[PDB]
Amino acid sequence: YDTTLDLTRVKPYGDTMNDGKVQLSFTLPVPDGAKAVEAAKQLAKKMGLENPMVVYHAPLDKNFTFFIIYGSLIHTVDYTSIQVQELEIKAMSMEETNEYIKKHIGRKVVVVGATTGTDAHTVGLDAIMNMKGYAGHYGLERYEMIEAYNLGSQVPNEEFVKKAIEVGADALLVSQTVTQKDAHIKNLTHLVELLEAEGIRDKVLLICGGPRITHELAKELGYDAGFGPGTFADHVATFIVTEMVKRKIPGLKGYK
Template sequence: MSSTEPTTGTVRPYGDTTGDGMVQLSFTLPLPLGPRAEGAALQLARRMGMDRPLLVHSKAVGGTDFSFFVVYGAVTHAVELSEVEVAERDYPLLSAKECDAAIDVRLGRPLVVLGACIGTDAHTVGIDAILNIKGFAGEKGLEYYKKMRVLNLGAQVAVGDLVRRARAERADAVLVSQAVTQRDAHLTNVRELSAELRAEFAEDERPLLVVGGPRFDASTAASLGADRIFGRGTTPGDVASYLVHALASEAAAVPAAVLEGVA
């Protein structure tokens, strides 16, 4: 968190002037486009706390049975910053060379990482950004790390198959990316995977379960049975540093003599 970022006080959305509360809201109603649907859209906006909402766009979608709306107006709500809870990073960020050195000192062997998209999820962009050597946001993926053995199993991997592969490969960590969220499929899949990992492995042998995706809430890791949840904007360095922190608990304190010349 930036040292200049405020942590107390009340904030409202900014549109034309500070604190005017102006927001833009878009949604779809299961009604054919017309005066009744437009009236329903405005009433919904008012009930959501929008003052004097304006209907700025409407369009029929899905044939004639649905309507899409964009509404603009001022919300009456405000947020007290002191009541906002965020998941702070509780481990240091390490370079690739520092991670390799830490793994070498604390584990004395390569750190084994399995990655996959599970269930029906075929969106591999996220898992590839973390694992593939080309990486993301100017950082090399985990395949670049000399002391990590990375296996990217790709898309639509069955939970049972992933658990069996984790056993066969003696995985230290299982990384799962989930982008398909219809009917909370991402939550169901993670809970199922967590349960099967715990059934297959003794607690002191179980690989870390690390989950990523744009619709996850980092604060729900424990309730889903995951060890860590990463959201939008996560880089390979974030994940690598966490794995080193969690799997080699003293890695962040590797003696300076070991790190000398690797930075």
């Protein structure tokens, strides 16, 4: 093969330019043996490896085999015309969010979350705010630059806003789970009305949460976004910091 590099035909690299040496490793659910090796080589041949050779194969169980394969890929990628997808946005890491807060904001992001009304459901907001988080996604209070305050299950809206004012909360988290007779939307509207009457609807992000609430519903009720059952703590932290830097809102520490 020609060893000159062509940027319209970028190909993997082994020890010589313009070859295709690539490495694979996968487990097939078949008993080990010659037939398993042939199956692995045929499978890797469909992926585009020209001369797939099973470097290694060993039985993980009576019906599982682990393979390592090397081959010269035939496919090529047009690097010169490749365009970067700027739309790729993802939740920041823990330390990434910490340094983001430290850079773009002097203060610690004060977050006050609480289930309000008569709901006893708190495993969601605890999944968001507790140190161990949820499925390895540590909660907001684990973050160095966040002062998370969790007020519990049955917190009346008056107590919630009072605690937010007392602590100087930059953002407020409300969790609603029981949707019987649409009691959740009623309580959320009451919360927004109380905040607006207090004159401090601004100055604070007002995020919503729950299993049967969606961004459309939150925006309908006047909340700054709302997170459904699939949310983790890093999602909430990324939103709470990004939307706070975008809209430069002052925490309630400046409210007397």
